[PDB]
Write a protein that binds this ligand. Structure first.
Ligand code: NA
Length: 129
């Protein structure tokens, strides 16, 4: 599913992500636009052989099992394919674990390079929240 901007904000808000670990909703919507374009089905391969899955491009070296990333962990205890659902629950739940891990949202490269330090409240402007 390809979300609209406000539709995804609302979804993220309902799943408790606004101000999770001190990260406002705009930061999460901005991260999702630059990671996936707001596509749940987005997959990207990494040079190391791991793969990033879903709206928030979560990586199978640490976080999910895809059966084809040797030696990897599965901290979120989910198949990577479940990160591709139209229902974002599993992605949000796993992203709460990731941002908790010590580096905050800097775990998402496109957040650090394209969202950090910018006016991220623009990403939720206009929305009925
Ligand atoms: Na894995």
């Amino acid at each position: 599913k390809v979300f609209g901007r406000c539709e995804l904000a609302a979804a993220m808000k309902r799943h408790g992500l606004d101000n999770y670990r001190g990260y406002s909703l705009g930061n999460w919507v901005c991260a999702a636009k630059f990671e996936s374009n707001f596509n749940t089905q987005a997959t990207n391969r990494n040079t190391d052989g791991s793969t990033d899955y879903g709206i928030l491009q979560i990586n199978s070296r640490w976080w999910c099992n895809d059966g084809r990333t040797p030696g990897s962990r599965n901290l979120c205890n989910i198949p990577c394919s479940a990160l591709l659902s139209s229902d974002i629950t599993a992605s949000v739940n796993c992203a709460k674990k990731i941002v908790s891990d010590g580096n905050g949202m800097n775990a998402w490269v496109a957040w650090r390079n394209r969202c950090k330090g910018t006016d991220v409240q623009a990403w939720i402007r206009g929305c009925r929240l």
